[PDB]
């Protein structure tokens, strides 16, 4: 019966919560109470990349750590050289409503997606000296929220219908489908090992997925609102989530429980982007109050403030070698900080 | 200049790209954008019929002006997470069927939708063009059935000219921004042809008022 099944589900949830409480002994703040703080950190704007004429919704650093890609609502996808602010490529999209972008690890391909429920893949290094639409992938029934390359022939895509997918670029087919979320999925993060990946949705719950077997491993429920961003700790044994209730949360998949909460009494707006740095000592968070913040990964105390944007900060990224931080905002300016 | 041979060519290529981007944006910022947000299937598919995937897009021209209409009724997802993408749209077109009063009630749900979309924090200064359609059915339905089924506190008569005005003023007072935004109302049906003229006049008024506010005169 439905009543018996919901009763036993509640009993299982109670047992899981009791085991979670039992397997917790000491807060990480207790261990790291007496650790030398990082001190105040001052970062300055080295470059400013003009050229967009609308809001900026995504950006991704290349593996060479010199080239980057940005996507705007003016139907434009632009590739920049960060050392000297020259425009390498400018690609016009079929639909303006784009809210995600990715840059291939090899460097030959780019991907984009948005409110058209289609993921478009463009080939960069081709003859004829232009860019062409390599492949269009369709099959989702909701707007596409994130995409992340696995290799030259596999990508992972999360949609607004509550389902993620692993594709095959050579022939467009849903190789694997991941289901289990109640609300629409907002973001996904891909592990460096490329064996597992994490997903965050609007049901205030995050999940871990195995790419090969296609079955969910764990589930984390700590927030009480929508989750807007997620990323992996460089080690691969932790991750961080940002939500609309103006708090960040650092979790782990070994102990399967909460580790840290980052909040303040003077912050009310939500978080739109989260990223780590090399060695995992700094959290970078973009907020809706025109401002960006830097947090210590072991202390909840703030360390630095990045101001200079005249609107909400939407996208934030850190290079592969950890030498610069790029931010975008709803005013058409990308800023590089060092 | 301390630049190598290739660096100057790269700079020239970047300059050409900048010129092309500016030229494209200048043309893009000269067109009119309208967000079509008709509730349900209340004649929304008809107005596009005589005025001529998740998001459907329609283009048309009138008096050397380009209109782009976005229909987003096929999403069926969380409306509060992709609605901020439509800031800066010139106008919001709303559609309501007048024959659904006795059919909870459809009209009350339409009222909830209008209230929710009119008082949103992203649309505090965006004009709404409201269409009341299926009038030809409505007049005979009124002369056959009373309006008190949907409206309990209605002391007026059972004629078309009074019921239509009562419904219009019942819809038009749901806005809490009586000064920043304005509501334009029209009565149309299948046989009417002058809808495009009404849309053009309303959008020209909106553009003129925005220009006057921008230059500091207001």
């Amino acid at each position, epitope marked *: 019966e439905l009543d018996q099944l919901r009763q036993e589900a509640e009993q299982l949830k109670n047992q899981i919560r009791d085991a979670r409480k039992a397997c917790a002994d000491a807060t990480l703040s207790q261990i790291t109470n007496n650790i030398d703080p990082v001190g105040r950190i001052q970062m300055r704007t080295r470059r400013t990349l003009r050229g967009h004429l609308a809001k900026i919704y995504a950006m991704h650093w290349g593996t060479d750590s*010199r*080239l980057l890609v940005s996507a705007s609502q003016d139907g434009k996808l632009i590739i920049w*050289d960060s050392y000297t602010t*020259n425009k*390498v490529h400018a690609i016009p999209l079929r639909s303006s409503w784009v809210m995600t972008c990715a840059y291939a690890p090899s460097g*030959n391909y780019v991907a984009c997606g948005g409110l058209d429920n289609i993921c478009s893949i463009y080939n960069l*290094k*081709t*003859r*004829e*000296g*232009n860019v062409r639409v390599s492949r269009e992938l369709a099959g989702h029934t909701g707007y596409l929220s994130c995409c992340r390359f696995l290799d030259d022939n596999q990508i992972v895509t999360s949609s607004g219908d509550t389902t993620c997918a692993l594709w095959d670029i050579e022939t467009g087919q849903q190789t694997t489908t991941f289901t289990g979320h109640t609300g629409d999925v907002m973001s996904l993060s891909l592990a460096p090992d490329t064996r597992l990946f994490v997903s965050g949705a609007c049901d205030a719950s995050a999940k871990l997925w195995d790419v090969r077997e296609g079955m969910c491993r764990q589930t984390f429920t700590g927030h009480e609102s929508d989750i807007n961003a997620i990323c992996f700790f460089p080690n691969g044994n932790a991750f961080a989530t940002g939500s609309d209730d103006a708090t960040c949360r650092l979790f782990d998949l070994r102990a399967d429980q909460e580790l840290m909460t980052y909040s303040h009494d003077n912050i009310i707006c939500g978080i739109t982007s989260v990223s780590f740095s090399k060695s995992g000592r700094l959290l970078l968070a973009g907020y809706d109050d025109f401002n960006c913040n830097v947090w210590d990964a072991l202390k909840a105390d703030r360390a630095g403030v990045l101001a200079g944007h005249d609107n909400r900060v939407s996208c934030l990224g850190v290079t592969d070698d950890g030498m610069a931080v790029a931010t975008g905002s709803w005013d058409s300016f990308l800023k590089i900080w060092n | 200049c*301390t630049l*190598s*041979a*290739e*660096d*100057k*060519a*790269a700079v*020239e*290529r970047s300059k*050409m790209i900048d010129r092309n981007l500016r030229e494209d944006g200048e043309k893009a910022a000269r067109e009119v954008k309208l967000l079509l947000l008709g509730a349900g299937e209340s004649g929304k598919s008809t107005i596009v019929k005589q005025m001529k995937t998740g998001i459907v897009e329609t283009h048309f021209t009138f008096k050397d002006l380009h209109f782009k209409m976005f229909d987003v009724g096929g999403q069926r997802s969380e409306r509060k997470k992709w609605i901020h993408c439509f800031e800066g749209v010139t106008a919001i077109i709303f559609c309501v069927a007048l024959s659904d009063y006795d059919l909870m009630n459809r009209m009350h749900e339409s009222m909830k939708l209008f209230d929710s979309i009119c008082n949103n924090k992203w649309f505090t200064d965006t004009s709404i063009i409201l269409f009341l359609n299926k009038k030809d059915l409505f007049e005979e339905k009124i002369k056959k059935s009373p309006l008190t089924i949907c409206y309990p506190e209605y002391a007026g008569s059972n004629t078309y000219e009074e019921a239509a005005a009562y419904i219009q003023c019942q819809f038009e007072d749901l806005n809490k921004r009586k000064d920043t935004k304005e509501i334009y109302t029209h009565f149309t049906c299948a046989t009417d042809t002058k809808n495009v003229q009404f849309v053009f006049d309303a959008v020209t008024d909106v553009i003129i008022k925005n220009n006057l506010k921008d230059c500091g005169l207001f």
Partner: single-chain antibody, 230 residues
Framework: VQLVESGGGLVQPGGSRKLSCSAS????????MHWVRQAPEKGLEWVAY????????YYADTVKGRFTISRDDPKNTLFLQMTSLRSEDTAMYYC??????????????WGQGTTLTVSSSDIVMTQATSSVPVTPGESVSISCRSS???????????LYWFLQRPGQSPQLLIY???NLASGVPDRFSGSGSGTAFTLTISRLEAEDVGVYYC???????FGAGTKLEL
């Protein structure tokens, strides 16, 4: 992709003629264009350059004010005004494309060329050995030397190693050192050590056999024509 040459032939000194380079199979409006000359008794020699959009035009210091070059993007063609010709202009003419951005590989594609029979502070490079035996199938290391150091302040070793096959048009072997792009086989590797240059091909092939031409692009003079026999 193909480039077809039209014009040329028997010309009296100081004549006037049209030279045309027709392109088909690629985006012509985004590529800069070069004209290259090869004398029957000599090697290659640069003539003229124009960029995309007719931005800048460059001529050789020995032909400055003698020729001129134009580009027609809507008609998709390249034109040269063959005028004021001396007695030493009889040669073979080649049309070359080149695109410059970060990571690009210019000088990739060459035309067939046209024959011309006429009636009757620069950097100079050198080659240590003017004739070397070659066995394909092994690893080959190649290097050229010049009158200046080719390294720029940006820190890239910067020199082009190029091949001419006997009987047909030349083709590209490697562009500036330490960088390998698409369009060429993966066997190539480049390296630089200030004044030490190195091109390494692990699997030498008959494709990489012929006459080379170490070339500079800093400030375009070709190296001495050295045919490495088999």
């Amino acid at each position: 992709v193909q480039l077809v040459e039209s014009g040329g032939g028997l010309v009296q000194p100081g004549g006037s003629r049209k030279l045309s380079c027709s392109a088909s199979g690629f985006a012509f409006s985004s590529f800069g264009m070069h004209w290259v000359r090869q004398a029957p008794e000599k090697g290659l020699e640069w003539v003229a350059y124009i960029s995309s959009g007719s931005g800048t035009i460059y001529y050789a210091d020995t032909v400055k004010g003698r020729f001129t070059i134009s580009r027609d993007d809507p008609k998709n063609t390249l034109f040269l005004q063959m005028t004021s010709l001396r007695s030493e202009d009889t040669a073979m003419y080649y049309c070359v494309r080149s695109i410059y951005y970060y990571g690009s590989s210019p000088f990739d594609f060459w035309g067939q060329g046209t024959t011309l029979t006429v009636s009757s502070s620069d950097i100079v490079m050198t080659q240590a050995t003017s004739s070397v035996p070659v066995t394909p199938g092994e690893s080959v290391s190649i290097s050229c030397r010049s009158s200046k150091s080719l390294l720029h302040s940006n820190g890239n070793t910067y020199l082009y190693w190029f091949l001419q096959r006997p009987g047909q048009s030349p083709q590209l072997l490697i562009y500036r050192m330490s960088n390998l792009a698409s369009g060429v086989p993966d066997r190539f590797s480049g390296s630089g050590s200030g004044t030490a240059f190195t091109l390494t091909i692990s699997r030498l092939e008959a494709e990489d056999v012929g006459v080379y031409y170490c070339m500079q692009h800093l400030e375009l003079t070709f190296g001495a024509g050295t045919k490495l026999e088999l």
